[PDB]
Symmetry: C2
Subunit: 136 residues, 2 copies
């Protein structure tokens, strides 16, 4: 019910309990142009988009930040996502939530990619997903 | 140093321990244009700005969402912030942190304005300020 309990529950949860699952993700490709990313943002609002290699959801190489997209479009919207892309951290489905949070912190990324046993993509996690568990 | 210890502490903290104080807030005015607002976003990067009345930081009447700003800038950036402004909530300085996230939730807003005893602006709270507390 209350916050301190939601905190306790979440303390024991793992990456796969909290993540946005692979089937619900919206991605952009390393070879799409900024202009493409811009139109995607305007349509879906997410502030961070996982960037795929080879148009493969199972090959997330980083993320693109909405700020970076709208800023660069004013400059040269034909540039490729790769010119703005920034790093992520990957974590196994079974990592305890706080351990992922700390991984995101040690690596200084706002996105963790949850990976399966084969190294495919199970889903992703960001702060917005943590705030849902703690505050419905 | 760990999550559960960080959550315990925050549970006992008050709206003013955690807010962004008035001196650090960035505002836009209700009579400023989208064009203005876009230039601010591009310069300062926050995703939400408190919107003032009469250019007064002590009269916050809502917030402006970056998504609304970039989206509208493309249609008619001469439009005024009031055309896209959305609702806030206000809380007293001494309201316990979990209780405010609850007010925010109840009133479906992403921002609380922390009020002083005269009704002036003490500061603001958004999810981000919560994460800095639990994560960072």
């Amino acid at each position: 019910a209350n916050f301190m309990q939601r905190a306790f529950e979440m303390n024991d949860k793992v990456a796969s309990d909290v993540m946005v699952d692979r089937t619900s993700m919206s991605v952009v490709d390393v070879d799409e142009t900024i202009a493409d990313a811009l139109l995607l943002y305007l349509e879906e609002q997410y502030s961070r988009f996982p960037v795929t290699a080879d148009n493969d959801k199972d090959k997330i190489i980083g993320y693109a930040y909405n700020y970076d997209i709208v800023r660069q479009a004013r400059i040269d919207d034909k540039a490729k996502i790769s010119t703005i892309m920034r790093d992520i951290v990957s974590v196994p489905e079974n990592m305890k939530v706080p351990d992922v949070m700390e991984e995101m912190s040690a690596h200084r990324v706002p996105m963790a990619i949850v990976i399966d046993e084969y190294g495919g993509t199970s889903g992703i996690i960001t702060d917005k997903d943590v705030y849902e568990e703690l505050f419905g």
